[PDB]
Amino acid sequence: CPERELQRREEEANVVLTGTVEEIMNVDPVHHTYSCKVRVWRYLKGKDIVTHEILLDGGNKVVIGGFGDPLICDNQVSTGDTRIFFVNPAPQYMWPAHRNELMLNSSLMRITLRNLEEVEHCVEEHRK
DSSP: OOOOOHHHHTTOOOOEEEEEEEEEEETTTTTTTTEEEEEEEEEEHHHHHHHOOOBOOOOOEEEEEEOOOOOHHHOOOOOOOOOEEEEEEGGGTTTTTTTOOEEOOOOOOBOOOOOOHHHHHHHHOOOO
């Protein structure tokens, strides 16, 4: 499965965060996708966006849908998994199915210093 260059992935994602998958949510029969409740650790990008467009659960939990999407290479998660999430707020025309949800935009990434550093780097450059 081919994935896009990290630079384009950072581009097509207004929000990049890190967190833990606490629970698997319901399935989306229409798109053959599922959602999960995630406990956010830190935002690598788009924190302001999530603050003004998402109603948070317990102030540190978000729901991310889009898991299982065939077009995304690394797209599976289990309870307890920790990853870097490249996401976008759920668009209007996807309500109320995915209202108040972040949708996976690209492949999940493992938590390692290399990854954290590389992503911050691209978030840093592009931000100029």
